[PDB]
From a paper:
By screening four kinetoplastid species (T. brucei, T. cruzi, Paratrypanosoma confusum and Apiculatamorpha spiralis), we succeeded in determining a 2.2 Å resolution crystal structure for the C-terminal domain of the KKT14 protein from the prokinetoplastid A. spiralis (clone PhF-6). Apiculatamorpha spiralis KKT14365−640 crystallized with two molecules in an asymmetric unit. Both molecules were essentially identical except for minor variations in flexible loops. Interestingly, a structural homology search using the distance-matrix alignment (DALI) server revealed similarity to a protein kinase fold with an N-lobe and C-lobe. The N-lobe contains a five-stranded β-sheet, a helix termed the C-helix (αC), and loops that correspond to the catalytic loop and activation loop, while the C-lobe comprises a bundle of α-helices. Although most protein kinases share a similar fold, we found that the most similar structure of A. spiralis KKT14365−640 in the PDB database was the Bub1 kinase domain. Human Bub1 was the top hit in the DALI search with a Z-score of 15.5, while the next best hit was the MST3 kinase (Z-score 13.0). The higher structural similarity of KKT14 to the kinase domain of Bub1 rather than other kinases is owing to an N-terminal extension that is present in Bub1 and KKT14. In the crystal structure of A. spiralis KKT14, W548 (the phenylalanine equivalent of the DFG motif, which is CWD in A. spiralis KKT14), strictly conserved among kinetoplastids, faces away from the active site. Similarly, in both the crystal structure of A. spiralis KKT14 and the AlphaFold2-predicted structure of T. brucei KKT14, the N-terminal extension makes extensive contacts with the N-lobe, which may stabilize the pseudokinase structure.
Author numbering: 367 to 640
Write the structure that this text describes.
């Protein structure tokens, strides 16, 4: 019944492979070639998620091949890969998730493989180069994705534009959103079934100022902050969301209310990025 006992038993049981790394075989992630387990990646770009004090990498699978996102967990008992897999099971995004854990359980890594399309951080869509209609389109899909997590009662707790990724397939017809660093995420239904309360030493409780994570309030405020970080804020509507005050109880319709006012224009996205 210990919080750690149940967290571990729960996330060891999810049907996603975790590859154990042997002493000496815990890579230092950086741009260039990285080998994790038997898997080789060419990391091309370093992403600095400054609000989370973390870095992430985007590259391709060994060969000029499949797009990938690679990053280290907060720690080797974060079960981040298992948390990201559970999350993937309820989103419409084509993603293969591989978890790697040091033999000493001290370090951890996640690789996520997408189909042969294009992968962009949400941050890319917030840059002042991007036309407004493309920016709004990405945020339109994010609204759907966060509304879907809200219904499932999964709270991410560390959402930023640097750790939300937009997958665009080779046709350019749509964006498919997958947030990534899930080390601190709250599966409220899972908690309730295993009889789990928050314990005072959880980075998630210290990081926010709360004694509990109850509902999607934290994720909704995260979403609103992303609107503050639009570098060419042209929309009075987007300006409105950036300054808005979060309702004390978050419901799916709070995401719907934002989504209804955003432009969906995949042609503007396609024209500027391809």
């Amino acid at each position: 019944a210990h919080f750690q006992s149940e967290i571990e038993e729960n996330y060891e049981a999810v049907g996603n492979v975790v590859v154990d790394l042997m002493g000496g075989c815990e890579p230092t992630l950086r741009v260039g070639r990285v080998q994790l387990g038997n898997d080789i990646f060419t990391l091309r770009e370093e992403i600095r998620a400054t609000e989370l004090k973390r870095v992430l990498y985007v590259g391709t699978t060994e060969g000029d091949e499949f797009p990938v996102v690679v990053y280290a967990w907060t720690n080797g008992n974060s079960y981040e890969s298992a948390k990201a897999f559970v999350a993937s099971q309820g989103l419409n995004v084509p993603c293969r998730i591989v978890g790697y854990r040091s033999y000493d359980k001290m370090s951890g890594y996640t690789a996520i493989i997408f189909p042969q399309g294009h992968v962009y951080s949400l941050r890319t869509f917030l840059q002042r180069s991007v036309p407004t209609r493309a920016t709004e389109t990405a945020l339109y899909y994010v609204a759907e994705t966060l509304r879907s997590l809200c219904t499932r009662r999964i709270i991410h707790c560390a959402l930023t534009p640097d750790n939300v990724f937009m997958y665009m397939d080779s046709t350019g017809a749509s964006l498919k959103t997958f947030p990534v660093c899930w080390d601190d995420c709250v599966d409220a239904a899972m908690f309730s079934e295993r009889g789990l309360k928050f314990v005072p030493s959880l980075p998630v409780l210290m990081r926010h100022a709360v004694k509990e994570i109850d509902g999607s309030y934290i994720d909704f405020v995260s979403f609103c902050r992303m609107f503050r970080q639009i570098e060419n804020n042209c929309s009075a509507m987007c300006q409105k969301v950036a300054k808005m005050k979060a309702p004390p109880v978050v419901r799916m319709t709070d995401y719907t209310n934002i989504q209804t006012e955003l432009t969906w224009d995949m042609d503007a996205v396609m024209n500027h990025f391809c």
